Design a protein around this ligand. Structure first.
Ligand code: CDL
Ligand code: CDL
Ligand code: WUO
Ligand code: WUO
Ligand code: MQ9
Ligand code: 9YF
Ligand code: HEC
Ligand code: HEC
Ligand code: PLM
Ligand code: TRD
Ligand code: FES
Ligand code: CA
Ligand code: CU
Ligand code: CU
Lengths: 73, 223, 115, 139, 299, 152, 56, 149
């Protein structure tokens, strides 16, 4: 990172690669979706899992698209 | 007594019919039949204020009673006349029994409570969570007759304990244990709620560790 | 309000119960009156009133910040009735007595609403 | 600051008249006589405006005209230091979290949580009140 | 047309209701006239004072017209004074109570059904007297030091009990049976929380309170007569809990001789439905039907 | 124990007892009864289903005759990690384990419906003898308690 | 930031600052370099409050 | 989420030993057999008692009970088996009840724990119930003392 983005960039670990966070988000979403497999008989929680996974996938996709298009760095 | 029966019906008609029916048969998806539940069920449900219920959810709560003792007797007599069932124990003067329900063997009562009761109510009747919005409540406010009739009638999701499964002397031992484990002081300081590790770990973090870190800050320096 | 209005589109209870509907108008009125309109008065005042009188600041800046955080956390306390099993307050935003007493509204939603 | 006092005095006149009229009109030809809740509320609303108006009126007759009370004051009349205005603080959110802890404790009737919340409130309010008064650390 | 201007108000079935409806129509016309004036003034300036393409200077900067300011505080004061006068007249007529009603009904609301009792009948022509009070059951409620003036909160003595009573059920809508042409008095008491006694064709409602006297509520109101026979819905109009929407009732208005026959049948041990069938009426409510006790369509 | 000793909606813990185990007056009887009480796969929950709910009972294959009418017997040992899973909700017919919140459907052969448990609770076959006392009608047809590498 | 607001003769509002190092001829501080150490943010923590007065 | 249309409290059944049944327009509540037992069975030739409460859902007309049959024996109805306009008909005096009766003369043995089919026939409605045996408020019978083993 540049010091304009992280002022103490030369004092410590200041950069995490974006691929790590994108892949971690996708894997976390997939893990939310795999907990639909279980013994539970209700589906309220299935909808909560689907919604949280959808929000995560949308955030990852927005970030990836905006980095590709150059709007954020 | 015919007067007691007409007072009970009169009280029942403007408080219980919407959910239980004019003939005590139940209103579907609103409230069950009361035929054969008995005076003991009425005593438990009304003296602890659970009845009349106010809405449908996971569990109907206890709350201040809507009726006094004679009105509770009248309602219980009216329900008893329709199907019979168990009754609330009485004393010589015909009052609801309280002190004579305290059994003499509290060690047997504790062993019985731990086998039959502590799974849902905890080691010392502090309450415990049940499946989905339900819970076995704290036992510290029930009087002896309420404990006795709670075992006798099996309220909401509490198992029903018949007088053949738990004889009256066993029930009296259990009520003695329940009452004495509610009235005994803590011996090692403030009891911290009686749940054990969770409030003890809360007390370490918010009292002991906060004190230790504050003392360290006082002794040490900043920057 | 959209849930209430959808349930009122047709006769019969299509997806709500009575209890949930009562919670819905109670909390819709509570949220719109006390968590949207009343604090947004002070949102507008914070935006422009010091400018309109030619001041650099309000009289008590930390008290101002405290007022905002009290708004936010009080509103969250009242709305959290919906995460209990019984649900939120269902006795109307006006909270008439004795419907609100412990005998007639026993749930924790009503007490969370009050505090 | 005579207009500031006048505003509250005018409100006071209306509130006192309304309180007297309501008490007299409910005592006569109203079921039960005096309606005590509304009468009490009107009397003490009158008291509220009276306290503030009397304070403003006493303050006004002490100090002579301020530049904001002067019809043709110049901007340069107001030159100088205004006072202290706190530049930043994270103590307000701590105070509100503490008070909300005590409130959740009172809602669910958990006396230990109420005790913890009251202790949190006292600590947070001390933190706010002392923030600009703690001296340097001593070693 | 009086129906379009009434805005959905029922025509009414009592003289008091008709007077209230006339006040409603007149007030609606006044408010529509004021609204038309103000809306027209808004539309006029929005249509004809918009910025043109050929104005370079700013408009005339007027900000004070004192005679107009004073003139626009007097006119609304006059309109509200007229409305206040007629309001007072009509509420005095509607709340008026005669010392000799011809039917006295006890209305008992509870969560969440109705009970109607026949307290007293005294026909004005001497053709029907009946004393229905049952004071041998009001005394059975006495609960007794007590938190409130020596009484526990379970005292319930303020409630009224009668020999002929129609009790509502979750499977039977309660039907109150009344004679046409007679002065009816309603005495309202609640068993628990506040309910609402609204018959829309009465064009009137009142709240039904627990312990009204201790709350300084006048729980008694009369209609001078009901001017036509028929069946009229009544609804609860004070939020009372879970089944506030599902505790309706019906008023069946019959001819006086049929009312006498109905009361004789009830005194002979008949229930409400069979006593209604005995006077050639539908036995159940016909404006409303009971709600399904299933909690909804997903059950 | 006799079948009429339990009401519909009741649940009792039962233990495997033999005539030869005795009443615990002698030393040897006392040791035998201590071994009964301390056996980790011993305790059994006996429930009595409400007769109105018997049409909702689903039987497990191989266990269709394990109930004596409306009396059912399951192991009280939780199949997840061995805690006594004994929080018996009579209206929902749900068996709740206090340790890690597994829930078993008593009407559907104690099949898990919530929590970390993947396996049903073992059913004890029960009947009565000539005197009318409840007795076991054989053994469990599967191992009881927590699972292990060697199982099934 | 000392928290003291001042109105200039032309109507500007400025907050008084306490520099942690040398200043300009204009009076603004020379910017200092971060050294990995905490920075004071309250004037009372720099001694501005003084001391009450010796005694019990 | 617990206060929706599927509610846990509102579908709860009575915590009693008898059974509910819908016979057309009649509600049969707390139906059970009284049959004190000594051994594994109650033998044929014993007379046991069938108890219930019949509630008239309708409030306009009346109703009457006919022909209770079963494959455990024969049922004799004694008393006025008519259930009134909006009233009840108590058949038998249950355990704690301080005269329509249903007497069952047994032909095959019965035992506490199992369910037995009975067919109720009203002049409008007729259904089969599967009735249990309920020891009511009777005490626990003594068990012979076990020896030492
Ligand atoms: C049930 C829930 C709660 C249970 C709690 C129970 C445990 C108690 C913990 C006790 C804490 C240990 C501290 C012992 C020090 C005593 C010696 C002393 O006089 O210290 C002066 C000491 C100043 O000496 P210093 O080390 O040179 O300070 C450096 C600067 O001057 C200061 O520079 P600064 O400006 O950076 O720091 C100022 C700071 C002062 O606070 C602190 O720095 C201490 C806070 C400790 C928090 C511990 C870490 C937890 C965080 C997570 O401001 C505050 O935050 C004020 C807080 C309000 C004061 C406390 C009032 C509590 C009353 C309760 C009712 O200041 C204090 O610590 C005063 C606060 C404590 C008041 C005495 C209370 C004693 C009795 C406690 C129980 C009754
Ligand atoms: C209740 C709230 C009362 C506050 C109303 C005063 C407004 C005046 C504005 C003002 O001067 O703001 C100063 C300041 C605002 O900071 P700022 O905006 O930077 O203003 C700086 C000033 O220009 C420069 O002023 P300063 O730095 O010299 O500080 C002025 C301060 C200096 O006064 C002091 O010496 C400290 C007094 C602190 C208040 C004690 C709180 C008591 C809580 C105990 C809870 C247990 C019960 O004087 C006052 O605030 C006068 C009020 C007198 C306190 C009496 C209140 C009794 C509490 C009633 C309990 C019920 O606020 C405070 O110092 C206190 C406000 C804390 C609010 C409390 C919120 C939670 C209370 C819940 C209680 C129930 C628990 C159960
Ligand atoms: C808000 C933002 C989104 C858009 C705006 C609004 C969206 C929300 C709209 C949802 C509407 C739901 C219905 C409302 C009414 C209600 O109250 O419910 C009805 C009934 O329902 C249940 O009955 C089912 C039947 O009606 C009964 O017929 C049946 O018998 C019963 O059967 C069960 O039970 C039996 C035993 O009884 C068993 O035999 C049987 O097998 C079974 O188990 C049924 O139950 P069951 O299927 O369990 O649950 C299912 C219920 C239960 O309600 C519910 O919707 C559950 C609640 C869902 C909550 C959604 C969470 C959203 C995620 C977060 C936003 C993520 C974080 C992001 C935040 C910020 C992000 C910014 C950084 O319906 C549904 O899910 C409806 C389906 C659709 C839901 C919507 C999902 C949308 C998300 C997907 C897209 C992602 C977002 C996009 C991102 C870019 C029982 O409960 C009843 O009492 C109850 O009455
Ligand atoms: C470095 C220092 C370290 C040392 C610290 C020491 C502090 C502790 C005190 C010292 C001990 C005293 C000496 C001997 C002990 C003693 O003499 O003791 C008496 C008895 O005492 C309790 O009897 C209560 C009644 O007297 C009985 O009548 C009743 O029966 C009993 O009932 C229980 O038992 C029943 C079964 O019958 C159940 O029915 C029932 O439900 C319940 O369980 C009662 O117990 P209980 O309610 O537990 O406590 C209630 C306490 C009240 O709470 C407490 O003070 C507990 C405080 C410590 C807990 C700390 C928790 C921290 C929480 C976290 C911070 C969470 C927040 C963080 C997240 C925030 C999120 C935001 C992001 O009473 C009160 O004073 C209430 C009024 C006011 C309280 C104030 C007292 C002191 C502190 C005040 C603080 C300042 C302001 C005032 C507050 C209002 C029981 O123990 C009994 O065994 C015991 O016998
Ligand atoms: C994984 C998991 C368990 C999930 C559940 C998490 C969850 C939803 C918890 C919150 C539960 C609550 C607070 C319910 C009501 C709804 C509600 C008000 C929610 C919050 C709304 C909100 C965010 C806005 C308001 C502002 C705000 C942040 C509120 C403060 C919330 C506070 C302070 C609540 C405490 C949170 C919490 C879970 C604390 C646990 C405390 C513990 C573990 C203590 C143990 C303990 C106990 C339990 C005793 O009984 C006891 C008895 C006697 C002495 C001591 C103790 C004791 O310490
Ligand atoms: C430590 C916090 C961690 C936060 C991480 C963020 C993750 C949030 C995920 C949200 C949770 C969604 C999963 C819930 C899916 C699920 O299973 O639950 C349902 C119940 O829905 C609900 O309530 C939804 C509740 C969601 C609440 C939102 C979560 C935020 C909380 C934690 C805020 C805390 C703040 C911190 C406090 C202190 C510190 C300060 C920060 C139904 O169960 P049940 O109960 O069986 O209902 C039966 C019927 O169905 C059936 O008809 C019939 O009526 C009955 O059978 C009924 O029982
Ligand atoms: C609807 C909101 C109700 C009102 C009003 C009353 N009761 Fe109720 N009751 C209702 C339900 C849904 C249930 C079942 C679950 C529960 O909460 O226990 C009950 C239960 C009872 C019982 C227990 C029956 C048993 O099986 O032994 C009794 C004795 C009882 N109710 C009596 C009762 C009385 C006397 C009421 C008037 C004061 C009353 N109930 C009101 C629903 C509702
Ligand atoms: C879980 C399945 C339980 C077991 C085992 C026992 N109890 Fe219980 N109990 C349980 C619940 C869910 C409830 C609340 C029911 C209600 O209708 O609201 C109860 C209630 C009681 C009470 C009444 C408490 C009161 O509020 O004061 C008592 C006295 C009580 N339970 C005692 C008790 C005893 C002695 C038990 C062993 C025989 C026992 N319960 C078992 C849940 C469960
Ligand atoms: C924000 C909450 C809006 C949804 C309403 C859900 C009501 C159900 C609560 C109970 O259960
Ligand atoms: C059945 C006739 C209906 C007549 C409706 C009258 C229209 C009301 C005017 C609406 C108000 C405009 C602002
Ligand atoms: S031991 Fe039963 S859930 Fe873990
Ligand atoms: Ca609808
Ligand atoms: Cu109502
Ligand atoms: Cu209502």
């Amino acid at each position: 990172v540049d010091v304009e983005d992280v002022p103490s960039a030369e004092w410590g670990w200041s950069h995490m690669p974006i691929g790590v966070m994108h892949i971690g988000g996708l894997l976390s979403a997939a893990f939310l979706l795999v907990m639909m497999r279980g013994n539970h008989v209700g589906h309220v929680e299935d909808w909560f899992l689907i919604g949280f996974a959808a929000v995560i996938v949308a955030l990852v996709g927005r970030n990836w698209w905006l980095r590709r298009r150059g709007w954020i760095r | 007594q015919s007067a007691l029966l007409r007072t009970g019906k009169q009280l029942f008609e403007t408080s219980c019919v919407s959910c239980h029916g004019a003939n005590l048969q139940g209103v579907p998806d609103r409230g069950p039949s009361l035929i054969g539940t008995g005076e003991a069920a009425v005593y438990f449900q009304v003296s602890t204020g659970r009845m009349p219920a106010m809405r449908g959810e996971a569990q109907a709560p206890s709350k201040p009673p809507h009726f006094d003792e004679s009105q509770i007797d009248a309602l219980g007599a009216y329900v008893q006349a329709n199907g019979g069932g168990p009754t609330v124990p009485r004393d010589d003067h015909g009052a609801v029994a309280q002190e004579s329900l305290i059994g003499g063997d509290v060690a047997r009562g504790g062993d019985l409570f731990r086998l039959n009761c502590a799974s849902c109510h905890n080691f010392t009747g502090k309450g415990g969570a049940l499946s989905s919005g339900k819970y076995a409540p704290d036992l510290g406010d029930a009087n002896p007759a309420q404990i006795y009739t709670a075992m006798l009638t099996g309220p909401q999701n509490m198992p029903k304990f018949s007088d053949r499964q738990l004889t009256p002397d066993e029930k009296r031992d259990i009520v003695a244990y329940v009452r004495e484990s509610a009235e005994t002081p803590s011996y090692g300081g403030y009891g911290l709620g009686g749940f054990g590790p969770a409030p003890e770990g809360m007390a370490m973090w918010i009292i002991g560790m906060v004190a230790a870190i504050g003392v360290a800050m006082w002794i040490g320096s900043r920057a | 309000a959209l849930f209430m209005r959808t349930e009122l589109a047709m006769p019969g209870l299509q997806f709500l119960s009575n209890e949930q509907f009562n919670q819905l108008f109670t909390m819709h009125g509570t949220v719109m009156l006390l968590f949207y309109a009343t604090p947004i008065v002070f949102g507008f005042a914070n935006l422009v009133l010091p400018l309109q009188i030619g001041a650099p600041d309000v009289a008590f800046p930390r008290l101002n910040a405290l007022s905002f955080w009290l708004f936010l956390f009080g509103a969250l306390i009242a709305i959290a009735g919906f995460i209990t099993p019984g649900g939120a307050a269902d006795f109307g935003w006006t909270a008439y007595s004795p419907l609100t007493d412990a005998i007639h509204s026993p749930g924790a939603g009503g007490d969370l609403w009050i505090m | 600051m005579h207009i500031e006092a006048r505003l509250f005095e005018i409100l006071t006149a209306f509130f006192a008249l309304a309180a007297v009229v309501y008490a007299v009109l409910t005592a006569m030809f109203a079921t039960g006589g005096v309606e005590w809740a509304g009468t009490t509320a009107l009397v003490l609303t009158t008291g509220l405006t009276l306290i503030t108006g009397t304070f403003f009126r006493f303050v006004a007759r002490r100090l002579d005209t301020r530049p904001e009370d002067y019809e043709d004051a110049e901007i340069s009349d107001g030159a100088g230091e205004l006072g202290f205005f706190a530049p930043h603080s994270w103590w307000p959110i701590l105070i509100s979290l503490s008070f909300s802890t005590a409130a959740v404790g009172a809602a669910l009737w958990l006396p230990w949580l109420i005790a913890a919340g009251v202790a949190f409130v006292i600590t947070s309010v001390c933190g706010l009140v002392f923030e600009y008064y703690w001296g340097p650390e001593k070693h | 047309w009086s129906d379009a201007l009434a805005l959905g108000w029922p025509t009414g079935i009592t003289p008091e209701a008709k007077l209230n409806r006339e006040l409603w129509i007149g007030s609606v016309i006044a408010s529509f006239a004021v609204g038309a004036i103000v809306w027209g003034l808004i539309f006029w300036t929005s249509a004809f004072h918009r910025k043109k393409a050929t104005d370079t200077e700013l408009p005339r900067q007027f900000g004070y017209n004192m005679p107009l300011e004073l003139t626009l505080t007097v006119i609304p004061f006059l309109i509200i004074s007229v409305l206040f006068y007629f309001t007072v007249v009509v509420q005095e007529r509607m709340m008026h109570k005669d010392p000799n009603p011809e039917v006295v009904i006890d209305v008992t609301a509870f969560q969440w059904n109705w009970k109607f009792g026949y307290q007293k009948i005294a026909f004005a022509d001497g053709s029907f007297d009946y004393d229905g009070a049952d004071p041998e059951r009001k005394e059975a409620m006495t609960s007794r030091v007590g938190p409130i003036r020596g009484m526990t909160p379970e005292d319930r003595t303020y409630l009224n009990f009668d020999k002929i009573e129609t009790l509502g059920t979750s499977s039977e809508i309660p039907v109150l049976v009344l004679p046409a042409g007679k002065r009816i008095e309603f005495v309202l008491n609640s068993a628990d929380v506040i309910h609402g006694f609204w018959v829309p064709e009465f064009l009137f409602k009142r709240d039904v309170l627990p312990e009204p006297k201790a709350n300084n509520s006048d729980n008694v109101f009369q209609v001078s007569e009901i001017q036509q026979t028929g069946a009229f819905v009544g609804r609860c109009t004070e939020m009372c809990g879970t089944f506030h929407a599902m505790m309706n009732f019906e008023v069946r208005v019959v001819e006086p001789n049929d009312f006498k026959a109905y009361i004789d049948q009830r005194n002979a041990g008949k229930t409400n439905a069979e006593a209604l069938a005995a006077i050639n009426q539908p036995p159940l409510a016909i404006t409303t039907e009971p709600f399904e006790s299933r909690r909804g369509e997903l059950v | 124990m006799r079948p009429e000793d339990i009401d519909a909606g009741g649940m009792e813990t039962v233990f495997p007892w033999r005539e030869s185990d005795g009443d615990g007056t002698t030393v040897e009887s006392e040791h035998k009864l201590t071994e009964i009480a301390m056996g980790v796969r011993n305790p059994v929950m006996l429930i009595r289903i409400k007769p109105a709910d018997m049409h909702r009972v689903i039987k497990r294959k191989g266990q269709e005759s394990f109930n004596f009418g409306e009396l059912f017997a399951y192991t009280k040992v939780c199949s997840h990690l061995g805690c006594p899973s004994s929080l018996y909700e009579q209206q929902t017919y749900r068996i709740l384990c206090p340790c890690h919140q597994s829930q078993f459907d008593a009407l559907e052969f104690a099949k898990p419906i919530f929590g970390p448990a993947a396996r049903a609770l073992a059913q004890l076959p029960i009947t009565i003898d000539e005197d009318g006392y409840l007795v076991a009608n054989g053994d469990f047809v599967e191992p009881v308690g927590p699972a292990f590498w060697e199982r099934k | 930031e000392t928290g003291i607001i001042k109105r200039l003769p032309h109507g500007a509002y400025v907050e008084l600052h306490q520099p942690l190092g040398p200043v300009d001829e204009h009076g603004h501080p020379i910017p200092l370099e971060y050294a990995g150490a905490p920075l004071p943010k309250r004037m009372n923590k720099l001694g501005s409050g003084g001391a009450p007065g010796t005694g019990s | 989420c617990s206060a929706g249309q599927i509610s846990q409290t509102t579908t709860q059944e009575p915590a009693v030993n008898g059974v509910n049944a819908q016979a057309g327009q009649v509600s049969l509540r707390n139906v059970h057999l009284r049959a004190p037992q000594q051994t594994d069975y109650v033998e044929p030739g014993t007379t046991v008692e069938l108890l219930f409460v019949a509630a008239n859902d309708s409030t306009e007309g009346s109703n009457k009970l006919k022909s209770i049959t079963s494959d455990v024996g024969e049922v004799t109805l004694t008393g006025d088996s008519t259930v009134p306009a909006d009233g009840v008909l108590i058949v038998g005096e249950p355990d704690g009840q301080i005269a329509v009766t249903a007497e069952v003369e047994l032909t095959k043995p019965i035992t506490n724990g199992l369910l037995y089919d009975f067919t109720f026939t009203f002049e409008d409605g007729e259904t089969t119930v599967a009735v249990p045996i309920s020891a009511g408020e009777q005490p626990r019978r003594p068990v012979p003392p076990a020896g030492p083993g």
